[PDB]
Write a protein that binds this ligand. Structure first.
Ligand SMILES: CC(=O)Nc1ccc(O)cc1
Length: 115
């Protein structure tokens, strides 16, 4: 199963768009966490591989995902980073959980169609 870059992008983009359409829940995830601006030097000590929606979109737009599971991995990386670093009742954690709910709903039929 070799994937054409534009077809992989076309099949996956709606799942990413669904995340972006979540307002306010996507908002903390539409751009990278910047620990220097936020003044949180511990962030990169906990989150070794940062990920966010803007980076996932750029990768999806620029043929950086050869296979669908690589995209799925990055989305889960984004979620797991947020759930690891932040308090359970924090806004970011709660918002993350909503995006995860949406993603789990969107991704299943898409991954089945691709496979
Ligand atoms: C997605 C995320 O982890 N955002 C975030 C983390 C720490 C902070 O102090 C402010 C925002």
């Amino acid at each position: 199963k070799i994937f054409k870059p534009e077809e992989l992008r076309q099949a996956l983009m709606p799942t990413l768009e669904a995340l972006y359409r979540q307002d306010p829940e996507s908002l903390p995830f539409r751009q990278p966490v910047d620990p220097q601006l936020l003044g949180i030097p511990d962030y990169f000590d906990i989150v070794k591989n940062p990920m966010d929606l803007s980076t996932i979109k750029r990768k999806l737009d620029t043929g950086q995902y050869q296979e669908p599971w690589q995209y799925v991995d990055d989305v889960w990386l984004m979620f797991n980073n947020a759930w690891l670093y932040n308090r359970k009742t924090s806004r970011v954690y709660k918002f993350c959980s909503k995006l995860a709910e949406v993603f789990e709903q969107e991704i299943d039929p898409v991954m089945q169609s691709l496979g």
